[PDB]
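Researcher: Please generate the 3D structure of the following complex. Treat every line as part of one assembly.
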Amino acid sequence: HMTIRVMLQAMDQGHLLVNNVDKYVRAGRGVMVYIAFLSDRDSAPITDEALRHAVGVLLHTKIFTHFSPEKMINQPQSLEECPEMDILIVPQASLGGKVKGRSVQFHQLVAKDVGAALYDRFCHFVRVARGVDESRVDANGAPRSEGDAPKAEGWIKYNSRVISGTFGNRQGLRFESEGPFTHMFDI
Amino acid sequence: HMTIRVMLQAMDQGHLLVNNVDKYVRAGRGVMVYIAFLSDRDSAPITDEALRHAVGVLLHTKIFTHFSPEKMINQPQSLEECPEMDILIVPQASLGGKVKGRSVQFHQLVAKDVGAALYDRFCHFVRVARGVDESRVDANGAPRSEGDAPKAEGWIKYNSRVISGTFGNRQGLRFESEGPFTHMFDI
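Model: Done. Output below.
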């Protein structure tokens, strides 16, 4: 079977480069997701029911403790129970890399076009589960009107965003966290 | 057997909170390493030869392509062949977390004192392999004289640093990357 590998970090602020040059899209407080789609030579392909299952694990699992600073007692919470948290998704296929002698081999990584399709589908499902108005956002989940985009510098509030990297691009990143509390799940 | 899980990211700049409040230590270009020590109930304890082996994997493997921007043709390079790159080590035991229903269980994580000992020993071996003058640095690998510390803001050059988080603290982070190219190795 095919594995969806994710690395999940507690995000306070993020900036992700989307055009390989100098255009960054922004997220506030929530979760930064690194994702890779992995495969055996003889593994069956990832269906929609399996992709949606993986989104459910991402959203339904109580993982992070930083969403609700106003809470008297902090417990792990799901993204689902905190609908306003932002999600920033970065394709990181290199998560499937393994050491081979003194180099790295990427034989577990799905082919480019398969990964592009799964990545696109996965970002769509997350947008839908977070109630994103897909007619008001661009390919990276940022506003279609540049005048609605968050300010370029200085702290911004979360706003139920689902921001995603441009597949196949260099994922230039600025990331701020009060404590990443990094999780790694194979799904 | 026990496992040293590491997540490795291409670092341009990093700031790591070391006192739970407002003191940050700095790294320039190199690699940011998240580390967890994992175990079965019936697994043997990690020896010094196995810790050193793990350091060898981190330093000898050609992984990253961002160390030498002056190179006409960029190939993966080892940290070993680029002695001036900085290393920023963050304890992230949560990497051993697994989904259990709608929560996370941490049953694979070594005990606190075992992890403290392995973490300390691992940071020591990295310092040694990078030629750090251990008499001129503090517990986090920053200068012992506060006047030799890098400037607090603005770009800084790499300088063969081995910076490491305070074990058991909250790992407040600011991270900049031209493309994290994230790897995940179980060693």
